[PDB]
């Protein structure tokens, strides 16, 4: 470079006082050209590639790309108050983050710094940002079910502990209350959630964190939250600290559930962080590195084998198809890096199905291996009925027919589709959604008033467990849908149909 960053007059004065003289500068460097969030520091020859260099004000920086003279760092906090000529010092640690079992409940600001304002957290650091992703021998296939809570998701597109599963919707249609529902249903079973909001308006993450507060998920969840008013480097590293913080609990034999929010926004902040560097972009001006970015991030969320202890981390990232096209660069990229998609269609949510899940497109590659041994057969029957309804509504059977549906199958498919809709943030237990699935698929109730199947089944769920606690026991202990359970739930729903008749 003709204009090299190591050509400030003061800087070359430091080298010109002694050419081949007394031993060089070890750890003290004056920041120069502290511009687009990327401070070029002179000196610091002891910096490990990836060091955690501190500044004068107190703004931490990663030393990613360090050239022959200038150790160009990526300062995390906004490089506003940093003036040229300030002295910096490396810390001697490689992208390390303080993490402990005391973060459960806090609201971290993507640098292991609390932003709730109630106290500071202590830890043993012990975790890295650029961690070695779990190897090939260490991952054991996903079998442990993860009770997302939503009927549609955990019935046809199941998620298992350790199987990443993105939530690819559109703008302003689900995925946030939907991911919050999946976190919220995790109250009884032990998980250490990490709801890491990459780009969200501060009011939205305030609403979500207060929802967690009043509904009790704060006993385990960890909102590593980064507002939309944050330098793109912090929105870039927010899911990395989220993932390292969840991995501190994944490696210690404890199931976790991390949820990135707007993983498209991390790619957008990386697009900013790179086009400020003027590194050459690719499709849609993404710097091409977004696949490696979402590989390091999403690939460190999988179930570990019994060698390293039975740990697990579903990743549930949330890409937003702002373009309205799933075949855009970052949505298809995260679909290629993830193990399955849960598409939240915009048109169905505008239509009224409140979990906007469409069943045809949204697939889960882990499949029925994830579901409980109870739900496999009944959800297979429900998926059969949903295929039937999908064809009957998408294609012919508009004129009455040779087939003549709405008498045999269209009514039942409509009952299923109007049954899949949930309330707002009202999670359903495993046995309850088992019975909700069973009622519609095997024809226990078909001729009801189709508008109010939910309005019936709220009374059904209220009555059945208080009438027959045997069902909750057979589903909670055996985890298998035995036929004696079918008989007793038949009796319970008979009595419920009676009390609904009167």
């Amino acid at each position: 470079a003709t204009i090299r960053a190591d050509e400030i007059s003061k800087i070359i004065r430091e080298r010109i006082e002694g050419y081949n003289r007394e031993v060089k500068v070890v750890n003290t460097g004056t920041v120069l050209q502290v511009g687009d969030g990327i401070a070029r520091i002179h000196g610091l020859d002891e910096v490990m590639a990836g060091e955690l260099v501190e500044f004068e004000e107190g703004t931490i920086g990663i030393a990613l790309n360090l050239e022959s003279n200038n150790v160009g760092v990526v300062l995390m906090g906004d490089g506003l108050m940093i003036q040229e000529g300030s002295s910096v010092k490396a810390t001697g640690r490689i992208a390390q983050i303080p993490v402990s079992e005391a973060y459960l409940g806090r609201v971290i600001n993507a640098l292991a710094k609390p932003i709730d304002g109630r106290g500071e957290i202590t830890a043993s650091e012990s975790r890295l940002i650029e961690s070695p992703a779990p190897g090939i021998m260490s991952r054991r296939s996903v079998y442990e079910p993860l009770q997302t809570g939503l009927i549609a998701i955990d019935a046809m597109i199941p998620v298992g502990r350790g199987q990443r599963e993105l939530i690819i919707g559109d703008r302003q249609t689900g995925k946030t209350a939907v991911a919050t529902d999946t976190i919220l249903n995790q109250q009884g079973q032990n998980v250490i959630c990490v709801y890491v909001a990459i780009g969200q308006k501060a009011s939205s993450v305030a609403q979500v964190v207060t929802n967690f507060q009043e509904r009790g998920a704060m006993e385990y969840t960890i909102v590593v939250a980064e507002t939309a008013d944050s330098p793109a480097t912090l929105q870039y590293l927010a899911p990395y600290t989220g993932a390292a913080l969840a991995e501190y609990f994944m490696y210690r034999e404890r199931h976790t559930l991390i949820i990135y929010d707007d993983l498209s926004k991390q790619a957008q902040a990386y697009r900013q962080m790179s086009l400020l560097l003027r590194r050459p972009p690719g499709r849609e001006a993404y710097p091409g590195d977004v696949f490696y970015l979402h590989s390091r991030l999403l690939e460190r969320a999988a179930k570990l084998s019994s060698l390293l202890g039975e740990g697990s981390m579903t990743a549930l990232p949330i890409v937003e198809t702002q373009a309205g096209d799933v075949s855009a660069y970052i949505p298809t990229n995260v679909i290629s890096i993830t193990d399955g998609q849960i598409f939240l269609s915009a048109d169905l949510f505008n239509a009224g199905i409140r979990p906007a899940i469409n069943v045809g497109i949204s697939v889960s590659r882990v499949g029925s291996a994830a579901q409980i041994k109870a739900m496999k057969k009944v959800a297979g029957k429900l998926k059969l009925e949903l295929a039937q309804f999908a064809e009957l509504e998408a294609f012919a059977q508009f004129a009455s027919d040779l087939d003549k549906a709405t008498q045999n199958q269209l009514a039942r498919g409509q009952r299923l589709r109007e049954l899949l809709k949930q309330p707002q943030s009202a999670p359903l237990t495993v046995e309850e959604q088992v019975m909700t699935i069973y009622t519609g698929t095997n024809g226990y109730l078909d001729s009801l008033e189709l508008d109010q199947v939910r309005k019936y089944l709220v009374e059904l769920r209220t009555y059945v467990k208080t009438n027959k606690p045997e069902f909750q026991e057979i589903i909670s202990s055996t985890k298998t849908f035995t036929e004696e359970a079918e008989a007793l739930l038949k009796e319970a729903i008979q009595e419920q149909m009676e009390r609904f008749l009167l």
């Binding site: 009011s203 207060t210 939250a225 939309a228 793109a232 086009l275």
Partner: protein, 481 residues
């Protein structure tokens, strides 16, 4: 702050790279005025802010006024802080440019108190929890597409549709019903439309030409004459001038930031000037970050709400491209003003069907409000459908189970039209403020089936529903004569 004299080394168009002594350097966004000399012979000083540092003590700064006539070597003076905006009760009524000097020539503004433009975000503990409905005073907005206090609002309709009378109604109703004041924040406002709006204000009692500091608007006009660094920072100027109101008087503030696409356009202009490699379709790389820094200080702090109302102009009419995408990622209520409805005369022209809000959900509004709003939207859907068929079949031939639907649809479409406290200068109607409870009960009575006998033109340009019954009873009195 200091006599940080530097030389304006490079002046490429609007961008002027200034050097500084190696001791003291203004950090990013730290405003600096240059002691310039105009061609006329007066020492006019064009103000700048450091958009970028270039290392060798040369901070690349963009200018808030024309750089025609800036020799290299001119004394540039640092202020040590971002652009000081003369906030306070004083800046209530006068017009402002970006640097904070009144251009309406009325007089000087009290700079006893001033806040920097680039104050950072509020905090997580300072944000408010409850998703609180913002009672505007328009029956359409309050029923169908409520506005979030502390949220964001999009007025998709262009000019000529009645946007100016709508925003004037909103400001006057904020000053009347609520306790707060508004801040029109016209960013890149075409000066003809700027003076149009200012005269509409001065003739509509929104700001008093005889009484300033009693008025209800803090006009911030960044005219498109000004360089790209100016009409970009006009949004943030209006934002801090409203944030002082919020965090000093604890009152509900309204920002009428004019069409955000001009702010994003100015960001693209200034980034292409700084040479930072462009992003997707051609807006700046720091598009999400910049527009989020503009629209994240719109938050209902525990002190008071600062809810804004931001026109949005989609280029080539797509929600897909990044600027409308990154904007609609932030908006919390989108209400379009419809040109055909405006030509009909259903003022306000806000379209009842295509307008939507994320607040409309029942846990936010109220179960009865969600039910009546969804039923009104379904009724207006039915009428938009049957507008095709009432041409062919007529109002009588079609079934009389949905003839009731068409009748109540005419009644709703008329009842949504509300006379304004601003339209008094044009037509002479007094103007009625309609609370949320009153319009809820009125729409419940209209759609439930009681008022199936009142005439269709009795609901047109009326306030509360009992006033509509009064209009109908007066028409009944005059029917004999």
């Amino acid at each position: 702050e200091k006599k940080n004299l530097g030389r304006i080394a490079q002046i490429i168009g609007p961008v002027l790279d200034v050097a500084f002594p190696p001791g003291k350097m203004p950090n990013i966004y730290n405003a600096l005025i240059v002691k310039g000399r105009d061609t006329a012979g007066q020492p006019m000083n064009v103000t700048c802010e450091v958009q970028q540092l270039l290392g060798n003590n040369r901070v690349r700064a963009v200018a808030m006024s024309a750089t025609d006539g800036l020799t290299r070597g001119m004394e540039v003076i640092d202020t040590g802080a971002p652009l000081s905006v003369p906030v306070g009760g004083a800046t209530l009524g006068r017009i402002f440019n970006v640097l904070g000097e009144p251009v309406d020539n009325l007089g000087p503004v009290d700079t006893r108190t001033t806040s920097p433009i680039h104050r950072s975000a509020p905090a997580f503990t300072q944000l408010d929890t409850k998703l609180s409905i913002f009672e505007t005073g328009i029956k359409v907005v309050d029923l169908l597409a409520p506005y979030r206090r502390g949220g964001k609002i999009g007025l998709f309709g262009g000019a000529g549709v009645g946007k100016t009378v709508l925003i004037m109604e909103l400001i006057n109703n904020i000053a009347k019903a609520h306790g707060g004041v508004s801040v029109f924040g016209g960013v890149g406002e075409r000066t003809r439309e700027g003076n149009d709006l200012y005269m509409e204000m001065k003739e509509s009692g929104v700001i008093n030409e005889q009484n300033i500091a009693e008025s209800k608007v803090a006009l911030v006009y960044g005219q498109m004459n000004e360089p790209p660094g100016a009409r970009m920072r006009v949004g943030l100027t209006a934002l801090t001038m409203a944030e002082y109101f919020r965090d000093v008087n604890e009152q509900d503030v309204l920002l009428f930031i004019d069409n955000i696409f001009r702010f994003v356009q100015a960001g693209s202009e200034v980034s292409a000037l700084l040479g930072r490699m462009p992003s997707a379709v051609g807006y700046q790389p720091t598009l999400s970050t910049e527009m989020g820094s503009l629209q994240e200080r719109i938050t209902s702090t525990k002190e008071g709400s600062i809810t804004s109302i931001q026109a949005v102009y989609v280029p080539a009419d797509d929600l897909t491209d990044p600027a409308p995408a990154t904007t609609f990622a932030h908006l919390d209520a989108t209400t379009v003003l419809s040109r055909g409805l405006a030509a009909k005369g259903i003022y306000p022209a806000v379209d009842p069907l295509d307008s939507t809000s994320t607040m409309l959900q029942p846990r936010i509004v109220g179960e009865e409000h969600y039910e009546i709003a969804q039923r009104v939207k379904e009724t207006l859907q039915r009428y938009k459908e049957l507008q095709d068929i009432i041409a062919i079949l007529g109002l009588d031939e079609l079934s009389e189970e949905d003839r009731l639907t068409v009748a109540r649809a005419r009644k709703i479409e008329r009842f949504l039209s509300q006379p304004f406290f601003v339209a008094e200068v044009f037509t002479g109607s007094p103007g009625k403020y309609v609370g949320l409870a009153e319009t809820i009960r009125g729409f419940q009575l209209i759609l439930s089936g009681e008022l199936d006998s009142l005439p269709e033109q009795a609901f047109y340009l009326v306030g509360n529903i009992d006033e509509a019954t009064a209009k109908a009873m007066n028409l009944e009195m005059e029917s004999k004569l």
